[PDB]
Write a protein that binds this ligand. Structure first.
Ligand SMILES: C[C@@H](Oc1ccc(Oc2ncc(C(F)(F)F)cc2Cl)cc1)C(=O)O
Ligand SMILES: C[C@@H](Oc1ccc(Oc2ncc(C(F)(F)F)cc2Cl)cc1)C(=O)O
Lengths: 669, 669
């Protein structure tokens, strides 16, 4: 393109053009996308904000002579390997003073962005660089999988010992190198390129090749080791720091695997996640079954199965989703979750309220609904709900949100009936589309798996508090059994305060309660039941049909048919047990709450709990053998004699008024 | 039964008869079953062994006044709760001096062996009693799920406020208690049994009941809490001590859940594992779909899905399987795995050997095969292989075994084609039986899940070393993706030395290698490749069709159709790369081994590694900030200047000759 206003980027560095031709952004151009997403992040928080370019800094990372990652500034496209890294320090609304994180990405323009030993080592170095600093690791997937190849320096000068040179088609016995052939390697110093054994015949000597190694690195097994390295490295990363992946062009083999290992992933439409090549798959299936790779690792597949937590219209949308996601996570490991107050204060009732005589969307309780006559506020801050895994297991809703600025993970039950339509089966010209009916408030294999996943994803890396608006009436298909224990495990491992609240029209029966009972992890869990909720081992219908047969029905009968009415009286007699009042009496819940006052209660209870948890931790550096009970008990003995321990606002208030004073007490131990 | 030789047990204590009528063993009679299994255990180890009854001791456990578990001796059937516990101290071949473990079981004769608050608390107390002492917990499942019921003391004297006493069928508004009714409760002191509000009408006062609580404990939510308690307690137990479950009569609700939470489970034929009642399921399905519960939680279902690791013809067979399983696990947490030498010494070659021109059963390589002309010894001790999860994911074989007495977990790839026949679908009169073809050396969703499970089950509680005869050529259905990371996670968590050995005719391609590469956990993992094995990113066929097209084929062609032969030359050229020799050159394996000499090598390498691991641990009590590298390096500096560090036998020999001497060195730090 001649005569253009300004210089042609795609000409100055053709690699940029190659990347675009691939349908993706040039690696070195991604940082600019983060500055834009970051800049937009401010505009949406406060339009009147004069932003200076020093609010976003990007510093590429390359290994020095000691293989140690260091910051440098060089011209794009100067990377010697197919892997690049950037250290980003940007000021955001959640962190005005600024925050940091790393970005690892494949250079799709460098050897089809394949994973070679040098690229793996680098990816591994970056990962631990982020883990060590407790910083989040963002990975941009755009690869072709593990690098492959043969010792090309042997394919031209390799000899074969046929059965008879006369009739070559008769077959052969082995391959070898001649005295000359062997000399050529010694000349290029590529002797190690092969293993042979001198053998003479009716002619001269014929060095029989027993094994080909090759002088080039990245032909086979060495690439498999590099993959395992980064695979296990990512696995550890996930339990250490915040990990997220964005599929920008395509992710193959180890690339697709890494997407799952990092767990949280956003897939850009059109960019497929391929484990094994489609063309190769048609070979292991016989006839041509698939046409394009999109039909395999497309968004309409990965996003629906839960592998892709989110999708993006394009790369910039992808970066924005990443940036928005991070707004809920701490600047770094072990750091207080990013507190962020907006126009929606904590002091206000909850407008939206579900009714037994009306279908509703759980989301309306979470963020709120917009009616024709105004906006009904929900339990959490307006527009603070960021849902994820929205294309899989619609039965349950998971997302981040804010409670008066306090970021937390939220899981709610979808009362509406889910209509999961499973596409036809390509590997079978007979089977077609299949519509599935996923009842509301009913646990399914995918629903339990999604719940466990959500819990772990909230706990690991994100380190956020959590609220589950428990509202399940049962389960059905054993996969439900297996994944079931996944949930209890995730809860035992939770390290932040948890809150289980059975919503108003909600209910919690049988094992649906067991899997989330506070006694699973009393150190972090508390359970509340709305005055309009219900809970019991069995639903009214099931109870009566067991402990209220017909003989007990007749005996009661004293109005002397009237079975229909007396029958309903049974259900009502039972229902009178599944009341929140009873829950309190039995002490199975911390207390019963009112939906409209919930927000005010939960905001202070959580703010108060976070304060004590902080203290319980600062105290976990004195006498080693100290029970958490003995810890919280000592800390509460520091409160003034007039402070009501049950008063959250007061307790939170005093503590925040004496952080240093309390610190001194700690230092004096 | 009159005139019987000896007293009639079933008469002395009718509960025994009730249990038998249930088709199960009486709880208090189970200890005797363990003495018999234990006694048989000796007969099979050494017939010439005069065993005295003091080799097996059983002491029941009940809570004292402080709720603390204590040992007592009382008449069977005197248990006040539906839960019983026994502490067993038996002398076994692996532990002549004796070993200990606990046995928790439901009393099916006590309120249909249902889980009540008192039973849950007890189950929880026993579990931690075992965890605290590091002792194994054996649970005998024979229950009816969580206890249920209503405040019966209200159903007879409860009044209803009809719309008009004239026409009761017209309906009602609420229920209440009269001045008299209220008095009756105050008389029985059951006032808390309900919550009311005095309300007067055209008549007198009518205490409207707003909530029914009941004076009896175990009606609803309190039972759900008890379940959650033991659910999360079992979950923790699994990561702490050796947990196993035996379904003796039936396990319902929380009972079935606990089976999964304890992971390792043995199901007796005929005894079903039911999550939700079948009769109730027919109600949530409309018409009668299922006839018996066996069709749901039967062995032909649980065992095939992997929930039941093993099945037993009857209870005693069940106990034997438990006893035999424990022979591979340590007396207790953190204790050296149970070393046990038999007639099959370590010093001997490996007889059985697979051939590319012959189908074989991986098991023959493991334990060996019995031919018409003698017995071909395998890699491990004869008859020491104890396979588990044998009815699910036949694609992979998992079990315990012994290497010259050294107990370890083993996983191997089933080369033969699996024929998983999925039964018809009852919830659909249209769908029938479906036969599935699971190719050998090919990873499937169930196969990866089974592998991860095996690894975790070996690591947690069992604390055993592990060997995986890696031999996978690929994978296929994404569930394979999800469960895939389950494997890498399990390896990162492994705490005992691991050994990955690609068998002779075996091979390891693509991601099949990544998921088990040593670099995933270098602290415990080592990888060996047989000289007759093959490994690479892609199989010969795939490689040539990518880096050896037709133009490269023709160019090479110098014999001037001959495509068939030249084509084969391609495959051979590539295959020459996937050789173990190359693996060594690239340093991706510790070394290449010979199948017949493997046993001798692995026996000493493992014995040597266990010795150093012990030392690396004893050293983990000195200078806190010490790298494992710095640890093993210091320990190896203690070896004599003449000892070859690479010589396992020598190293193992010296160390075992100077345990105390080394101890002194440690104490002097
Ligand atoms: C209270 C209840 O105990 C149960 C019942 C089923 C149960 O198993 C499950 N519970 C929940 C799920 C999930 F994950 F879907 F919520 C799965 C199972 Cl298998 C656990 C405890 C009972 O015994 O009635
Ligand atoms: C070496 C290979 O990298 C891969 C390929 C696929 C891959 O994903 C999986 N690998 C193994 C399994 C399992 F568990 F079946 F063994 C599953 C997946 Cl998704 C991981 C790494 C490559 O890029 O060619």
């Amino acid at each position: 393109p001649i005569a253009t206003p300004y210089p042609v980027k795609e000409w100055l560095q053709p690699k940029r053009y190659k990347a675009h031709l691939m349908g993706t952004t040039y690696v070195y151009d991604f940082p600019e996308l983060f500055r834009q997403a970051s800049s937009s992040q401010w505009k949406n928080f406060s339009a009147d904000v004069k932003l200076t370019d020093d609010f976003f800094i990007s510093n590429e990372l390359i290994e020095d002579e000691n293989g140690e990652l260091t910051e440098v500034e060089r011209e794009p496209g100067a990377n010697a390997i197919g892997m690049v890294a950037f250290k980003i320090t940007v000021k955001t609304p959640e962190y005005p003073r600024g925050r940091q994180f790393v970005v690892v990405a494949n250079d799709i323009t460098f050897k089809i962005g394949s994973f070679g030993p040098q690229e793996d080592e680098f990816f591994n170095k970056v990962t631990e660089y982020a883990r060590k600093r407790g910083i989040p690791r963002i990975y941009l997937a755009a690869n072709s999988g593990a690098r492959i190849g043969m010792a090309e320096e042997i394919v031209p000068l390799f000899q074969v010992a046929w059965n008879d040179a006369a009739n070559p088609d008769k077959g052969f016995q082995y391959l070898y190198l001649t005295s000359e052939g062997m000399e050529t390697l010694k000349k290029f110093d590529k002797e190690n390129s092969v293993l042979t054994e001198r053998t003479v015949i009716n002619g001269e000597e014929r060095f029989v090749i027993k094994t080909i190694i090759g002088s080039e690195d990245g032909l086979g097994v060495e690439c498999l080791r590099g993959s395992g390295l980064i695979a296990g490295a990512t696995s550890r990363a996930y339990h250490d720091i915040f990990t997220i992946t964005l599929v920008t062009c395509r992710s193959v083999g180890i690339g697709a695997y890494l997407v799952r290992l990092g767990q949280r992933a956003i897939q850009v439409e059109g960019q497929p996640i391929i484990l094994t090549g489609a063309p190769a798959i048609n070979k292991m299936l016989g006839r041509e079954v698939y046409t394009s790779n999109l039909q395999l690792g497309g968004t309409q597949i990965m996003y629906n199965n839960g592998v892709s937590h989110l999708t993006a219209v394009d790369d910039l949308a992808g970066v924005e989703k990443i940036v928005e996601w991070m707004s809920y996570v701490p600047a770094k490991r072990n750091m207080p979750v990013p507190i962020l107050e907006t126009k929606d204060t904590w002091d206000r009732p909850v407008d939206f309220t579900p009714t037994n005589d009306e279908t509703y969307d759980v989301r309306w309780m979470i963020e709120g609904r917009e009616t024709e006559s105004g906006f009904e506020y929900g339990l959490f801050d307006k527009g603070s709900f960021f849902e994820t895994l929205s294309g899989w297991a619609k039965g349950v809703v998971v997302g981040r949100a804010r409670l008066g600025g306090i970021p937390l993970g939220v899981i709610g039950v979808e009362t509406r009936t889910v209509e999961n339509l499973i596409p036809a089966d390509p590997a079978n010209p007979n089977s077609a589309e299949t519509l599935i009916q996923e009842p509301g408030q009913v646990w399914h294999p995918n629903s339990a798996f999604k719940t466990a996943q959500a819990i772990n994803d909230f706990n690991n890396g994100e380190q956020l508090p959590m609220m589950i608006l428990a509202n399940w009436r049962g389960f059905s298909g054993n996969e439900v059994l297996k994944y079931g224990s996944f949930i209890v495990d995730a809860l035992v491992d939770y390290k932040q305060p948890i809150i289980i609240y059975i919503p108003p029209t909600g209910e919690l029966r049988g094992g649906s309660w067991v899997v989330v009972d506070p006694t699973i992890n009393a150190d972090q869990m508390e359970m509340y039941a709305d005055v309009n909720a219900r809970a019991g081992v069995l639903e009214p219908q099931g109870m009566v049909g067991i402990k209220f047969r017909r003989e007990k029905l007749l005996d009661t009968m004293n109005r002397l048919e009237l079975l229909p009415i007396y029958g309903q009286i049974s259900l009502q007699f039972a229902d009178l047990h599944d009341r929140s009042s009873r829950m309190v009496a039995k002490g199975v819940i911390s207390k019963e709450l009112e939906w409209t006052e919930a927000r005010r209660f939960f905001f202070w209870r959580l703010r108060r709990r976070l304060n004590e948890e902080y203290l319980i931790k600062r105290l976990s550096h004195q006498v080693g053998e100290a029970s958490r009970l003995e810890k919280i008990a000592r800390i509460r003995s520091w409160y003034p004699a007039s402070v009501d321990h049950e008063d959250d606002r007061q307790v939170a208030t005093w503590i925040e008024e004496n952080y240093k004073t309390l610190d001194d007490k700690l230092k004096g131990l």
